[model samples]
Target: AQYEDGKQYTTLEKPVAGAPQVLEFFSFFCPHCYQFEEVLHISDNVKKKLPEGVKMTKYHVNFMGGDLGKDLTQAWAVAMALGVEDKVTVPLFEGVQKTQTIRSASDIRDVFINAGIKGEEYDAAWNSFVVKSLVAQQEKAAADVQLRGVPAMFVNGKYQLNPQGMDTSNMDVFVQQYADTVKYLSEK
Candidate 1:
């Protein structure tokens, strides 16, 4: 997501609680985020080594500036609310990363429908308050954080992780290091 000057900072209404939260701020259009998806899944395995109560949540940044981007952002929120994130998140990533064709909301909707969610259910999910709320939440997060790019992460609201900043040659290593950092900080 691109940064715009003179924007107001929007703080999270409810900070992630009950555990050390690993929040990944990412976008569907980001090549780095696409490449990092598999690495993130691997990091999920590494997360098991951490102490109990460590939780990870992903937020899709939506300031890419286009109708397609807007649709995709909303689609992700809908998928999350439908309890089918695992079904759509990675596929959506692949759809955008691997395909040359432009992806839109209808495309995403077709994917969801093919993934076993009925069209009515998908529509209802898309229109649900939870999904709309999440879209607003993401906008607020981007504004408050002054986010400049995707694939940025925050650990317990204290540590920020950027693969590019880490100077790692491999995405997997960067993600693993991030997971390790989260475990270490949560244990502290």
Candidate 2:
């Protein structure tokens, strides 16, 4: 916990306690997040460097796509509930940013349906109490983080990585620096 304050990250006022974690605040409508996952593959890179037992959780922010934001967050929660995040995350990003094919709750549902999830199964999870509560909690967590934008990462729910303060001139440098910082912060 001897990280350079403000240079690499700023310590959160409220530190979440649990297994060491890296929580990313993102949105389906965020073009940068699309690039982060699709173009840059930052999340995958970071995951490779994480310590065993450490978890990385993506919390969909609720303030991005107007009312559609909540629906998309619910979509993500449903995916998690049904263990289909790997199938839907990229497609959701593609649908929202690239293809412009997904525009509504039903559109999001279609993506899942196309992934081989039955419409009834998708609807069941989407409206399930667990998914609804998970979405609500994610929204509250995003607000608690006091995020300025999407693609924010918090190590152990305490150190908020500072992208502007890092040397992000190139993807190689940025990815290495990002992974190193997360590894350093994950240590107790």
Candidate 3:
């Protein structure tokens, strides 16, 4: 069955094949995700200190888009399809954060253009049936998992981190603590 929208779940059944842990759930417009960026990078440094099976994958939340939820979902889906998520994700965040630009469909398209993706390709990816399905899947995941906000994270379905757990105000501590949490969880 197709994944339903507006649900939340605890486990990630198909974990990243080899990574010991997964960093799931984030959003581009989320200030917390921005703050968490520093921590995520820092966590990378600490990763060497920990055992294997440690990696992070970001999933953007789309529930805040109101009537434009589908469009926002398409934006994320297209980026994932193009396999240029890393190239455009940070830039998109910066565009939305610093420029005061509303992250609407048009704004998202411009961000992709600035990132060197051709407009036609962007359109194609946006309207692609496959991308649409993926976006639906993401929406389903967010809903099924009962996510309350951006920057929420799940580690191997065993641990979940919310803004309170990894607030932006103390990102360094949170990131370190998160790595510690993952290490401890994995050991169990």
Candidate 4:
């Protein structure tokens, strides 16, 4: 992988064996992350550019660490576990960022509801042990990577996309840079 800036995206570790992994660390309550979501439309925008051997995942970050963060982390865990991550991802940020009110398990639920989730279905998944375990698993994964902040993309748990090293005024360039980096790293 080459960059004009001469900064490396690879971490001290290495990419996964077969394909590369991309996990974004973020929180719903984070204003910066909120703005990022509004601008990037991550799933809608970035996912389309990804090539084979790169799987993007979102990990609920606890840097905000509070009832809101905890609730949303689990909510997100449930969202992904229940396969609603794509559906709720946008609205989750839209609701929380615009409303400027977050916390409580129910608050997260209302956000999902607005995103078109059924009440009974959300209830079951939100409280399921599977969701809890998934949350724990992802939380551990974030910790394992020594997460610093929201919107940090880890490549194969071994490298991170450095936002400071480039001019990201044009997000297309930034996304392309990210995609290129992952594509290069994922090459077998």
Best by lDDT: 2
Q: Backbone collision count in every prediction?
A: 0, 0, 13, 1
Model 1, 142-188: lDDT tens per residue? 66556777767655654555444444577667666656655665554
lDDT per residue as tens, model 3, 61-164 = 77665645456567878988999976776777677676757457797798889889999999999889989787876766666556777766565654454334
Worst 10 residues of 4 by lDDT: 11-20
Clashes of 1: 0
lDDT tens readout by residue for model 2, 140-184? 777666776988898876788887777569987887788888888
- Candidate 3 vs candidate 4, lDDT winner: 4
lDDT, candidate 4, 1-188, per-residue tens: 34632363645464334322766778887777775667755444556566755567777876685767788888988898778887887777766777655556787798778778889988998889999898887788777766767777766655666666755678777656666665554452
RMSD of each: 7.0, 2.1, 7.7, 2.8
* Best candidate, TM-score: 2
TM values, all candidates: 0.78, 0.91, 0.72, 0.84
TM-score rank order = 2, 4, 1, 3
> Which segments of model 4 are wrong by more than 4 Å?
4-10, 13-20, 42-44
TM-score of 4: 0.84
Q: Which regions of candidate 3 are displaced past 4 Å?
A: 1-23, 38-55, 68-70, 162-171
Per-residue lDDT value at 177 in model 2: 85
Candidate 4: residue 83 lDDT (0-100): 87
Candidate 3 structure lDDT? 0.63
